[PDB]
Symmetry: none
Subunit: 74 residues, 6 copies
Amino acid sequence: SVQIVYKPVDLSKVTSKCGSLGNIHHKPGGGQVEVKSEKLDFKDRVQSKIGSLDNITHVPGGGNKKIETHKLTF
Amino acid sequence: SVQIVYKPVDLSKVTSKCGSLGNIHHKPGGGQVEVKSEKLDFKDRVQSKIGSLDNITHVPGGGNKKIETHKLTF
Amino acid sequence: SVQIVYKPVDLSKVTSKCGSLGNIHHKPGGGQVEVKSEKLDFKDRVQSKIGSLDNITHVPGGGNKKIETHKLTF
Amino acid sequence: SVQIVYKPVDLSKVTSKCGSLGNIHHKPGGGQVEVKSEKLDFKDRVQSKIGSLDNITHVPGGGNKKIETHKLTF
Amino acid sequence: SVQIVYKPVDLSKVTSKCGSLGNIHHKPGGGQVEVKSEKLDFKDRVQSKIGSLDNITHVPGGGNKKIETHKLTF
Amino acid sequence: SVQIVYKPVDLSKVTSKCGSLGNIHHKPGGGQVEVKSEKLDFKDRVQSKIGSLDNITHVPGGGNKKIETHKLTF
């Protein structure tokens, strides 16, 4: 006979406590771009991007993360 | 017989306490770009990216992470 | 007869405490780029990147990490 | 008096047996070419061929040639 | 008086047996080429070929040639 | 008086047996060729070839050649 009994337990206090968050990006950017091309002749899937500025700003008022995974296999 | 009994137990406090925060990027950037290209002849999948300022500003008011995993196998 | 009894127990306080955080990046960047290119003939998958200020800024108000893993196998 | 009697026989079994016969040509790459030729001044007959990638792929389910030759002469 | 009585015989079993016969060519890269030729001045018949990758793949399920020759002569 | 009676016989078994027969050519490389040439002044018949990678892959499920020759002569 085979038996499995499986009971994972968590009590977690994953937290943050911020008294005053803040962020500024003051007068960023600038810069010319040129791209010039001839007979580029791609033979499979392409992606491009072009530009003076990219600005991924990501500012959570607390941004905590919890990740878990339970498996079993006979 | 094959008995298995499995119980993980966690009590956790995973925290950040932060009396103030701040983040200033001030006049970042500038810079010209040129790309000149000829007879390039790519033969599998391409990604390109071209540009003067690429800012990425990830700034949580606490950004704590808990990552866990449980397995079993025969 | 086989028996396994498996009980890991944790009480943890993985934490941080900051009186006042702060970050400044002040007038960063500048710098021309040129990429002239000719007769390159790439036979397989390509990533290119070109640019004048590539700023990944990552500033959590405490950024604690806990990483955990439980196994069993026959 | 002269006579020729010529009575050849051949009964030969000439065979092959196979299973899962095949080919693969995953991504033949060829390449870039250039033929900046000048003042070549050919005084007699020419044949030419130019290209990135030239292929022959020949796959008979048996190539079992039987080839013969017979003569008589005074 | 003269006579010839020529009576050759052949019974030959010629065979092969196979299973899972095959090929792989996987990403044959070839290459860049260049033929900057000048004033070549050929006084007689020419044949030429240029190119990055040249391939012959040849895969008979059997190649079992039987080849013969017979003569007679006064 | 003359006579020739000529009675050759052949009974030959000629075989091969195989399993999982085949070839692999994984990433053949070739190269960055160049043939700059000048004032060559050929006085005679020519044949030429140029390229980065030249391949033959010949893979019979059997190669079992039987090759023969017969004569008669006064």
